[PDB]
Amino acid sequence: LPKPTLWAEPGSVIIQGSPVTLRCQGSLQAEEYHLYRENKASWVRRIQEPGKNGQFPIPSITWEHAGRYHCQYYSHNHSSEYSDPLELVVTGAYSKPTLSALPSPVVTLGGNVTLQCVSQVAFDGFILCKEGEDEHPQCLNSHSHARGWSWAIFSVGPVSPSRRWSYRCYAYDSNSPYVWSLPSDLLELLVPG
């Protein structure tokens, strides 16, 4: 039976000391749940019999709150399968990095530009974001699947389209960073209203 849906009411990448709630949507005939996982134990909200999901608010958050998050609505008899693991992130812990436009902040119409993200400390993890219109801050992380077999990944958060929203990826080797393979099969993202 359908795995629940779990997102964060205000957002996912939050600043320490900010209100946040973890809303779980599943089958309306839901009586229990399942949350946070890093070592077995759980935050369960046994909702009566209404038509209002099972939220999980927290006024002040901490760094420990940061990790994976998955719910699991339980029925009078039926037990459902887990859902999508949520990536809650708390910011403002270490030394703020620097983002430098290469070469010039001024950029031509449809040009290329190298944005340098630096810091005073050694780091092998960085984030790039973007600011749109009505909506709020949106960032992207990149990780790799080196173990077993190699290929990178592109972790994106709260998306906000306007016109065309399609993604295509490439592949190459460091021997030649300018000569690349053929684009991938057009992947079209789906969004409700």
Q: Which listed residue (2, 7, 26, 81) binds its own copies by CB under 8 A?
A: 7
Q: Is 100 in the site for its own copies (CB under 8 A)?
A: yes
Number of residues forming the site for its own copies (CB under 8 A) = 110
77 vs 104 by CB, closer to its own copies = 104
Q: Is 68 in the site for its own copies (CB under 8 A)?
A: yes
> CA-to-CA distance for 164 and 156, rounded, in angstroms?
17
Select from 135, 139, 187 the least CA-distant residue to 166: 187
Task: For residue 101, give the 3-state DSSP assignment.
Answer: strand
- Give the list of residues 6+ apart from residue 182 with CB closer than 8 angstroms, or none: none
Q: Is 180 in the site for its own copies (CB under 8 A)?
A: yes
| Smallest distance from its own copies to CB 165, Å | 7
Q: Which helix (H) or strand (E) holds 99?
A: strand 98-102
User: What is the rounded radius of gyration, in angstroms, for the C-alpha atoms of the chain?
Assistant: 20
| Smallest distance from its own copies to CB 100, Å | 8
| Smallest distance from its own copies to CB 51, Å | 17
| Smallest distance from its own copies to CB 156, Å | 5
End-to-end distance of the chain based on CA atoms, in angstroms? 25
Q: Is 28 in the site for its own copies (CB under 8 A)?
A: no
